[PDB]
Amino acid sequence: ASTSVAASQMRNALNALAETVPDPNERKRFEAEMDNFFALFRRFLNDKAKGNWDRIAPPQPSQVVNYDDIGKESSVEFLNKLAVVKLNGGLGTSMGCVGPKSVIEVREGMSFLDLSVRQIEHLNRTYNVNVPFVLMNSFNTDQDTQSIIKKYQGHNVDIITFNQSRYPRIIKDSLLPAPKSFDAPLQDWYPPGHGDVFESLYNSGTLDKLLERGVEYIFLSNADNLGAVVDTRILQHMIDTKAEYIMELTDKTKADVKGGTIIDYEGKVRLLEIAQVPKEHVNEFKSIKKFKYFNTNNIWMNLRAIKRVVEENELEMEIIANEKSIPAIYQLETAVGAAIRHFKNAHGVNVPRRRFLPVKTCSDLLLVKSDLYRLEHGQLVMDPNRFGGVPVIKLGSDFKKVSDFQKRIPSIPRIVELDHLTITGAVNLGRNVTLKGTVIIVATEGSTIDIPPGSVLENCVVQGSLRILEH
Amino acid sequence: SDLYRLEHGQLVMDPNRFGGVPVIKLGSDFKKVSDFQKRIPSIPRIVELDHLTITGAVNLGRNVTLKGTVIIVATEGSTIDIPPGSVLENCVVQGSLRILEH
Amino acid sequence: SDLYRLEHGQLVMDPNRFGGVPVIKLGSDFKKVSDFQKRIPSIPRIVELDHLTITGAVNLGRNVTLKGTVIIVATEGSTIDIPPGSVLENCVVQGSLRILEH
Amino acid sequence: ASTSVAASQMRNALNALAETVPDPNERKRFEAEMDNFFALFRRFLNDKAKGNWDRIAPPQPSQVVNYDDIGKESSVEFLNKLAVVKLNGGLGTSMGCVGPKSVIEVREGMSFLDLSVRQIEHLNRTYNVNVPFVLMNSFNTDQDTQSIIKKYQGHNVDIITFNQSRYPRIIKDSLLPAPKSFDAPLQDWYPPGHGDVFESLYNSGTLDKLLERGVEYIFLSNADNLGAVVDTRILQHMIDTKAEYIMELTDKTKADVKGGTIIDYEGKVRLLEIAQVPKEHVNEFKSIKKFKYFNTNNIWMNLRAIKRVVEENELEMEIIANEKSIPAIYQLETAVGAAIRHFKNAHGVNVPRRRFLPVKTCSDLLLVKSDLYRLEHGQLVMDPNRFGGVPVIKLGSDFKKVSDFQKRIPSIPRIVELDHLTITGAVNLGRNVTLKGTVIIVATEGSTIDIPPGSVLENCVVQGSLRILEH
């Protein structure tokens, strides 16, 4: 009974916000937006009252296509109908940086956004075609974004921006929205999951704006994955298979045992994570067998398919519950891959790892700024002279914040011919440091190790304390 | 060191060296000529060096370059293994650092 | 270790082991085969181990299990007595720990 | 087949040594002595070639008599037939002391042997009876023993001494006796287990010497257990039950989980230890249930029964194999309790723990020298004011040798009202130190803690380093 009472109170609270609003257009948007959460909230309570490893069958050979099997490059003429959409909801707060994550620099002063545009520019200049580049922004970044985007004026680049849905936070105890007024503080709201993209594209009118230029194929990728470069080869497979949803996949490395994996689920290709795998089978799920692929989040989609699922309202997503404590609330989120099940001819492709190089933590930023990578017209390609895979770098807990990183490593060490590197404690690397083979540095608790400039280290362990002060 | 060249058996200082000979004063640990080969397997480059002091256990790897003034003061009883290729310019070095093969 | 089994005198690695053989590199203290029996009275379980480094005085108790990468760096001159039954997963270990019978 | 070959070679080697002998009396002794080992060696190989927890049934209520149930003290008249025999095979080498263990001092300069005689002396003077006191010596101690025993001359004390069997060491590889000649070095011989007492008493003529004074009851106890005082109460139970073998037992404490325990074995009361309990059940055997008693080694026996088992050759013992490395060899030994099976009406008595206080290690010598015990005419009785059991004292590895003990603890600390004490590392205790409750001392590795004189410690942890040097 309490569920119906809560639903009634929730409905009245959701409607009360919709009643206190200054403009009709906002009311229309807010009503449709807020009415979706009422249904979600109902399912959430119902799904908890209702609460299968047997159904977790391995992906059949028919469900995965190999990149080496795809045919010749797609003709330039077909690129006019392609479209690229980027998630732009990440703040630099994740890495202790001010502003949006997209604005933080990576190499030679360029921002992560800069490379994307630069990649778009490379396509237009090589064939004189204008691929639309849409940014799914967030309320936390739009204000900073609206400022910085002006730097891209002039240059032949069609930039369009929109803000995703702004749902309010729901009080954990009362199960009611924390904000009362329409102009309530941002702390009362949170951005929902990636799946909001489909409706957001429509609700903002971007779908019309996109349809206005006749784009038929949509490509999504996270701004954090610099490897998501436009490759005309993949578009041909799409044009041939006319699939409604194609996800790029990669073979799980030792570090990719965790994270989502595609499941056949009786042909109806699905996905699952630790968020829903039963604890009694997580160890089984972590086995290298049966689950050999993971979700890269690089996805190719049909714009009219997106329209149809929205027009049909068939879009139903796996709710993800997150909690926070406002100085307690619940948040509902969704994944970009979960939509795979509701699409015809939906199947995946396995691509070489050169397409997945995320920048989530300090250990990544060092690899990209080193001499191991070179930028050509905005594309990062590893030196063909490098044998084996990428070297493993794992810095200690002292290098968490991106600001401090510049203090301890004023110049990036030469990492060619390096095999494995571990750094723990206070370590300062001078200029022109060369590392070869395996290098293990373990600073004494509370002491500092100042690696002398010009140092050449080969297969050795370093431990102790060394101070270098100017005479 | 590389500061001297042998011609038909005569030592002549490099005409490129400005000023007098640099002052080198090693600590009490390097007294015996036999041990000298253990701690300094390869002589460091001493061109452009001004003054050098070494006290305590100091091991110099190959291709070490010293410029200006270099003062090395090892902790009593501990050892300082200067990593190979090190380039030192006008600075004081103190502490302990072990380099063991992996 | 438990990674190999002998059948009529032939060694074949367990087909369950993925990838190549794990890399093991013990420190300079374990040179002599006699001492080896003192510090490692029972071989640690090495299935699912990826990389292991041991430097300095390290004593491994019985039923020690190592998973992923394990780096043990003993303090110069001190000893680390890994307690029996220890299960280590992807971590660095440094310090000194003595286990004496009550 | 190899067993017969080894037995044949052993026989020839044993007989060859017995043939090369200077005197007939030795030949008589050596022939009987050496012939016993041939039979033992045969059984050893046979038992090894042949190689039951199901049969390990708990002791039935009929197998154990309680000390509180035994009747009134036995009348003085019945004491003329009692006899006490002591094992005197322990060397001070076990505790890093020179000479026999029996000679090392315990309190006020008295040796462990001194107290035994002193206990006998008190008994003879209170009733004018002369109980014979026989010492089962060893070749390792007789030479020092023959010297020191002279100090007991004059005083009304009948002292008789004899040496137990001297068996040769058997080479591990050849399975042959290591010594060749008759005058071979002592390193080629070893004293066998306690069970050798029965034959040794006979073969030495001591049985005649005892029978010559009409003694009918024999009592055995180890010289190391100062609690083995002659108590006329137990002799009455013997006179009443006329049992052929009575062993004193005590309830296993937390420290007595290990060590031998009586087993009913279908009425045929036996004993077993880790030496024969199956490894798959040792953990089960260590449980507090089923095995609640352990062997104290205090045993009461009938002298004519001992004679009969020797005359009848019914004496069969559980062989114990021990190994040594002469600067490898095998040694065969037996336990004083195992003989229980070959005796009629053999049953045990459970006595209060005041009868078991061994002196095996440093932790024992501290308890006995403290103010917690007082000596009256040579008998130790704990102060009736002490509540609870004896306090637990466990000194660290630095106090192993008895010589060093005098350096770090020049005066014993007051231990009344002490509950638990732990000492690790270099700790020096000054004079007049008082400990109350629980005291934990943990010295820093390599440093020393000099507890200042007069210190009073109550329920506390002590850690650090403190030096006291004369001004």
Side-chain angles (χ1 to χ4, degrees):
Chain A
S2 57
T3 58
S4 180
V5 180
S8 181
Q9 292 292 355
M10 170 67 80
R11 177 190 169 279
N12 300 346
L14 297 172
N15 293 357
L17 169 65
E19 289 157 27
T20 51
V21 182
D23 297 346
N25 177 275
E26 299 301 337
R27 286 169 177 275
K28 296 174 187 184
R29 172 56 183 160
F30 273 68
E31 285 162 359
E33 177 183 58
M34 299 298 283
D35 265 12
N36 310 144
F37 198 95
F38 184 41
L40 295 179
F41 174 84
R42 176 156 48 256
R43 292 211 305 275
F44 184 115
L45 299 187
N46 300 343
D47 297 346
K48 282 176 54 173
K50 288 176 176 185
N52 177 9
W53 186 259
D54 179 82
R55 294 299 82 222
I56 296 178
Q60 301 303 294
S62 59
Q63 309 297 24
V64 178
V65 171
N66 188 288
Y67 181 83
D68 298 337
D69 197 28
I70 291 172
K72 191 173 180 180
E73 292 72 19
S74 70
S75 168
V76 175
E77 180 182 336
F78 297 82
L79 309 180
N80 184 65
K81 55 176 66 180
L82 181 60
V84 182
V85 187
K86 294 281 191 182
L87 303 185
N88 181 44
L91 280 171
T93 52
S94 50
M95 307 193 300
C97 308
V98 298
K101 185 182 295 179
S102 51
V103 177
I104 308 168
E105 68 81 36
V106 66
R107 179 176 188 111
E108 296 159 47
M110 294 184 69
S111 71
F112 298 102
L113 177 60
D114 291 299
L115 280 83
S116 308
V117 167
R118 287 305 318 300
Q119 297 148 12
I120 311 307
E121 183 248 317
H122 196 53
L123 270 79
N124 72 61
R125 192 193 71 259
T126 54
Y127 335 105
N128 204 250
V129 290
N130 298 302
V131 176
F133 183 66
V134 191
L135 302 180
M136 180 171 160
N137 308 334
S138 72
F139 62 84
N140 283 321
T141 63
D142 197 68
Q143 306 319 311
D144 308 339
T145 305
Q146 281 197 58
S147 178
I148 68 98
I149 60 186
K150 298 192 169 77
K151 80 128 289 177
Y152 304 110
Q153 286 165 358
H155 305 80
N156 183 54
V157 184
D158 176 27
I159 296 162
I160 294 173
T161 55
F162 70 117
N163 54 295
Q164 79 166 117
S165 306
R166 187 192 89 187
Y167 286 113
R169 296 185 200 183
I170 274 57
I171 296 179
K172 165 173 290 185
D173 48 276
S174 66
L175 301 176
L176 294 172
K180 176 62 176 183
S181 65
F182 174 84
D183 59 353
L186 290 80
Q187 288 68 29
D188 296 351
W189 315 82
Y190 81 98
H194 308 166
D196 184 36
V197 62
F198 308 107
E199 62 268 41
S200 298
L201 195 79
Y202 217 146
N203 311 145
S204 58
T206 306
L207 188 138
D208 315 57
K209 292 182 179 183
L210 290 164
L211 180 61
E212 281 157 39
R213 214 165 72 234
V215 297
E216 299 304 326
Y217 302 111
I218 285 276
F219 175 53
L220 261 74
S221 52
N222 195 306
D224 75 1
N225 176 21
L226 285 181
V229 183
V230 176
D231 172 12
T232 70
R233 292 171 174 168
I234 295 168
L235 182 60
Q236 196 54 59
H237 182 64
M238 166 65 79
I239 290 160
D240 295 353
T241 61
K242 300 189 179 181
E244 295 189 316
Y245 186 103
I246 304 182
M247 181 192 300
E248 305 177 14
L249 299 173
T250 42
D251 296 358
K252 288 177 170 271
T253 69
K254 277 281 184 172
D256 312 320
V257 295
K258 197 171 181 179
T261 188
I262 289 295
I263 206 76
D264 175 271
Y265 212 88
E266 312 94 67
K268 297 183 181 180
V269 190
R270 190 153 173 67
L271 163 71
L272 39 62
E273 279 190 347
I274 277 62
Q276 71 267 73
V277 165
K279 297 182 181 181
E280 306 96 313
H281 303 275
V282 298
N283 179 53
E284 310 188 341
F285 167 87
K286 284 175 179 184
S287 177
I288 286 170
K289 282 174 183 180
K290 303 181 181 180
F291 314 109
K292 71 173 60 178
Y293 312 115
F294 72 110
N295 187 356
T296 70
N297 309 274
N298 303 344
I299 297 158
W300 301 83
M301 305 190 207
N302 176 310
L303 182 61
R304 294 175 196 253
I306 290 168
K307 181 182 181 183
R308 282 165 63 267
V309 295
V310 178
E311 286 299 316
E312 294 168 340
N313 195 47
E314 182 160 321
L315 179 57
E316 179 177 313
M317 312 202 79
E318 189 71 41
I319 303 181
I320 302 169
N322 297 326
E323 292 164 41
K324 299 188 179 191
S325 51
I326 307 178
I329 68 85
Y330 274 103
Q331 298 192 172
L332 308 187
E333 297 179 55
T334 60
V336 78
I340 188 170
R341 180 165 56 84
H342 315 124
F343 290 117
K344 297 179 181 182
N345 288 8
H347 72 285
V349 176
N350 195 304
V351 289
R353 216 171 194 269
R354 64 181 169 78
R355 297 189 63 77
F356 186 83
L357 177 56
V359 180
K360 302 298 199 178
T361 187
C362 57
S363 296
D364 311 325
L365 189 65
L366 200 171
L367 186 64
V368 294
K369 289 178 176 294
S370 74
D371 56 343
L372 186 55
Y373 280 87
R374 285 173 179 273
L375 186 77
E376 295 178 29
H377 260 293
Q379 294 79 256
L380 293 181
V381 185
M382 189 161 65
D383 178 3
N385 297 272
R386 168 63 185 191
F387 296 84
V390 300
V392 172
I393 294 179
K394 296 291 182 179
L395 271 49
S397 54
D398 293 349
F399 297 75
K400 289 166 65 70
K401 300 177 62 179
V402 179
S403 52
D404 292 349
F405 191 101
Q406 296 153 69
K407 195 171 71 84
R408 300 193 183 280
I409 308 182
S411 60
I412 314 302
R414 292 213 61 226
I415 73 173
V416 299
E417 311 306 307
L418 172 63
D419 298 333
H420 176 298
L421 167 66
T422 295
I423 306 184
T424 75
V427 179
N428 304 313
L429 302 178
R431 71 174 62 260
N432 201 0
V433 171
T434 295
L435 310 178
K436 293 181 184 180
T438 296
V439 167
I440 308 297
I441 297 166
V442 185
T444 302
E445 58 195 326
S447 303
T448 300
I449 284 179
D450 292 333
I451 301 301
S455 294
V456 173
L457 296 173
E458 184 164 38
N459 297 319
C460 53
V461 157
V462 178
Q463 168 183 9
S465 76
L466 194 73
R467 282 160 61 249
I468 297 172
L469 301 172
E470 194 176 322
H471 168 85
Chain B
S1 74
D2 56 343
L3 186 55
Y4 278 87
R5 294 169 185 272
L6 184 76
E7 295 179 29
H8 259 290
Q10 294 78 255
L11 300 187
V12 185
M13 189 160 65
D14 183 8
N16 297 272
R17 169 63 185 192
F18 296 83
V21 299
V23 173
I24 294 179
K25 295 292 182 179
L26 271 50
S28 53
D29 294 350
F30 296 74
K31 289 166 64 69
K32 301 176 62 179
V33 178
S34 52
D35 292 349
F36 190 100
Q37 296 153 70
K38 195 170 71 84
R39 300 194 183 281
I40 308 182
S42 60
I43 314 302
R45 292 213 61 226
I46 74 173
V47 299
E48 311 307 308
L49 172 63
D50 297 333
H51 175 298
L52 167 66
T53 295
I54 306 184
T55 75
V58 178
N59 304 313
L60 302 177
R62 71 174 61 260
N63 201 0
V64 171
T65 295
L66 310 179
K67 293 181 183 180
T69 296
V70 167
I71 309 297
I72 297 166
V73 185
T75 302
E76 57 194 326
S78 303
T79 301
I80 284 179
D81 293 333
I82 301 301
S86 294
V87 173
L88 296 173
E89 184 164 37
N90 296 319
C91 53
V92 158
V93 178
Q94 169 183 9
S96 76
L97 194 73
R98 282 160 62 248
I99 296 172
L100 300 172
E101 194 176 321
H102 169 84
Chain C
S1 74
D2 55 344
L3 187 55
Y4 280 87
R5 285 173 179 273
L6 186 77
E7 295 179 29
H8 260 290
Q10 294 78 255
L11 295 181
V12 185
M13 188 161 64
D14 178 3
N16 296 272
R17 168 63 186 191
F18 296 84
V21 300
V23 172
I24 294 179
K25 296 292 182 179
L26 271 50
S28 54
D29 294 349
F30 296 74
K31 289 165 64 70
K32 301 176 62 179
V33 179
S34 52
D35 292 349
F36 191 101
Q37 296 153 69
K38 194 171 71 84
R39 300 193 183 281
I40 309 182
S42 60
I43 314 302
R45 292 213 61 226
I46 73 173
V47 299
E48 311 306 307
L49 172 63
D50 297 333
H51 175 298
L52 168 66
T53 295
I54 306 184
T55 75
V58 179
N59 304 312
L60 302 178
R62 72 175 62 260
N63 201 0
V64 171
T65 295
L66 310 179
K67 294 181 184 180
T69 296
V70 167
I71 308 297
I72 296 166
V73 185
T75 302
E76 58 195 326
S78 303
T79 300
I80 285 179
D81 293 333
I82 301 301
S86 295
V87 174
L88 297 173
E89 184 164 37
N90 296 319
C91 53
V92 157
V93 178
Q94 169 184 9
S96 76
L97 193 73
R98 282 160 61 249
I99 297 172
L100 300 172
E101 194 176 321
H102 168 86
Chain D
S2 57
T3 58
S4 180
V5 180
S8 181
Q9 292 292 355
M10 171 68 80
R11 176 190 169 279
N12 301 346
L14 297 172
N15 293 357
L17 171 62
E19 289 157 27
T20 49
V21 180
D23 297 346
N25 177 275
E26 299 300 337
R27 286 170 177 276
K28 296 173 187 184
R29 171 58 188 164
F30 273 68
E31 285 162 359
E33 180 181 59
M34 296 293 283
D35 264 12
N36 310 144
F37 197 93
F38 182 40
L40 294 179
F41 176 84
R42 178 158 49 257
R43 292 211 305 275
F44 187 42
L45 299 188
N46 300 343
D47 298 347
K48 282 173 53 173
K50 288 176 177 185
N52 177 9
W53 186 257
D54 180 82
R55 294 300 82 221
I56 295 178
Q60 301 303 294
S62 59
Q63 310 297 24
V64 178
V65 171
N66 188 288
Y67 180 84
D68 298 337
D69 197 28
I70 290 172
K72 191 173 180 179
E73 292 72 19
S74 70
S75 168
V76 175
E77 179 181 336
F78 297 82
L79 309 181
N80 185 65
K81 54 176 66 180
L82 182 61
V84 182
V85 187
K86 294 281 191 182
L87 303 185
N88 181 44
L91 280 171
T93 51
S94 50
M95 307 193 300
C97 308
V98 298
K101 186 182 296 179
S102 51
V103 176
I104 308 167
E105 69 81 36
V106 66
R107 185 185 293 107
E108 296 161 47
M110 294 185 70
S111 71
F112 298 103
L113 176 60
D114 290 299
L115 281 83
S116 308
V117 168
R118 287 306 319 301
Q119 296 147 12
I120 311 308
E121 182 248 317
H122 197 54
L123 269 79
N124 71 61
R125 195 193 73 258
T126 54
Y127 335 104
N128 203 250
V129 291
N130 298 302
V131 176
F133 184 67
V134 190
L135 302 181
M136 180 171 160
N137 308 334
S138 71
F139 63 85
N140 283 321
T141 61
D142 197 68
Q143 306 319 311
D144 308 338
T145 305
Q146 281 198 58
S147 178
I148 67 98
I149 60 185
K150 298 192 168 77
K151 79 129 289 177
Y152 305 111
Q153 286 164 358
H155 305 80
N156 184 54
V157 184
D158 177 27
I159 296 162
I160 295 173
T161 55
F162 71 116
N163 55 295
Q164 79 166 116
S165 306
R166 187 190 88 187
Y167 285 113
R169 296 185 200 183
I170 275 57
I171 295 179
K172 166 173 290 185
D173 47 276
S174 66
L175 301 176
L176 294 173
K180 176 62 176 183
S181 65
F182 173 82
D183 59 353
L186 289 80
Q187 288 68 29
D188 295 350
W189 314 82
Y190 81 99
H194 308 166
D196 185 35
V197 62
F198 307 108
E199 62 268 42
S200 299
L201 194 79
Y202 216 146
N203 311 145
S204 58
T206 306
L207 188 138
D208 315 58
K209 292 182 179 183
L210 290 164
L211 180 61
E212 281 157 39
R213 214 164 72 233
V215 297
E216 298 304 326
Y217 302 114
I218 285 277
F219 175 53
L220 260 74
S221 52
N222 195 306
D224 76 1
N225 176 21
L226 285 181
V229 183
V230 176
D231 172 12
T232 70
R233 292 170 174 168
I234 295 168
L235 183 60
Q236 196 54 60
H237 182 65
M238 166 65 78
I239 289 161
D240 295 353
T241 61
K242 300 190 179 181
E244 295 190 316
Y245 184 101
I246 304 182
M247 181 192 301
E248 305 177 14
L249 300 173
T250 42
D251 296 358
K252 288 177 170 272
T253 70
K254 278 281 184 172
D256 312 320
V257 295
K258 197 171 181 179
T261 188
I262 288 295
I263 206 76
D264 175 89
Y265 211 87
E266 312 95 66
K268 297 182 181 180
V269 190
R270 198 150 183 68
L271 163 72
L272 39 62
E273 278 190 347
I274 277 61
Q276 70 267 73
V277 165
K279 297 182 181 181
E280 306 96 312
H281 304 276
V282 297
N283 179 53
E284 310 188 341
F285 166 87
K286 284 175 179 184
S287 177
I288 286 171
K289 282 174 183 180
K290 303 180 181 180
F291 316 111
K292 71 172 60 178
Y293 312 115
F294 72 109
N295 187 356
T296 70
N297 309 274
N298 303 344
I299 296 158
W300 301 84
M301 305 190 207
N302 175 309
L303 182 62
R304 295 175 196 253
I306 290 167
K307 181 183 181 183
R308 282 165 63 266
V309 295
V310 178
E311 286 299 316
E312 295 169 340
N313 194 47
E314 182 160 321
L315 179 56
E316 172 180 310
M317 312 205 79
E318 193 73 42
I319 301 181
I320 303 169
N322 298 326
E323 292 164 40
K324 298 188 179 191
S325 51
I326 307 178
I329 68 84
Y330 274 108
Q331 297 192 172
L332 306 185
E333 297 179 55
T334 60
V336 78
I340 188 170
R341 177 163 55 88
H342 313 120
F343 291 116
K344 297 179 181 182
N345 290 8
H347 71 285
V349 175
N350 195 303
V351 289
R353 216 171 194 269
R354 64 181 170 78
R355 297 189 63 77
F356 185 83
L357 177 56
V359 179
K360 302 298 199 178
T361 187
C362 57
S363 296
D364 311 325
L365 189 65
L366 199 171
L367 186 64
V368 294
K369 289 177 176 293
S370 74
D371 55 343
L372 187 55
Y373 279 88
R374 285 173 179 273
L375 187 77
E376 295 179 29
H377 260 291
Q379 294 77 254
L380 295 181
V381 184
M382 188 161 65
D383 178 3
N385 297 272
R386 168 63 185 191
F387 296 84
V390 299
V392 172
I393 293 179
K394 295 292 182 180
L395 272 50
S397 53
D398 294 350
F399 297 74
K400 289 165 65 70
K401 301 176 62 179
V402 179
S403 52
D404 292 349
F405 191 101
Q406 295 153 70
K407 195 171 71 84
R408 300 194 183 280
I409 308 182
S411 61
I412 313 302
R414 292 212 61 226
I415 74 173
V416 299
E417 311 306 308
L418 171 63
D419 297 333
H420 175 299
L421 167 66
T422 294
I423 306 184
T424 76
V427 179
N428 304 312
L429 301 178
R431 71 175 61 260
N432 201 0
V433 171
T434 295
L435 310 179
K436 293 181 184 180
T438 295
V439 167
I440 309 297
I441 296 166
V442 185
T444 302
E445 58 195 326
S447 303
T448 300
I449 284 179
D450 292 333
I451 301 301
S455 294
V456 173
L457 297 173
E458 184 164 37
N459 296 319
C460 53
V461 157
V462 178
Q463 169 184 9
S465 76
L466 193 73
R467 283 160 62 249
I468 297 172
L469 301 172
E470 195 176 322
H471 168 85

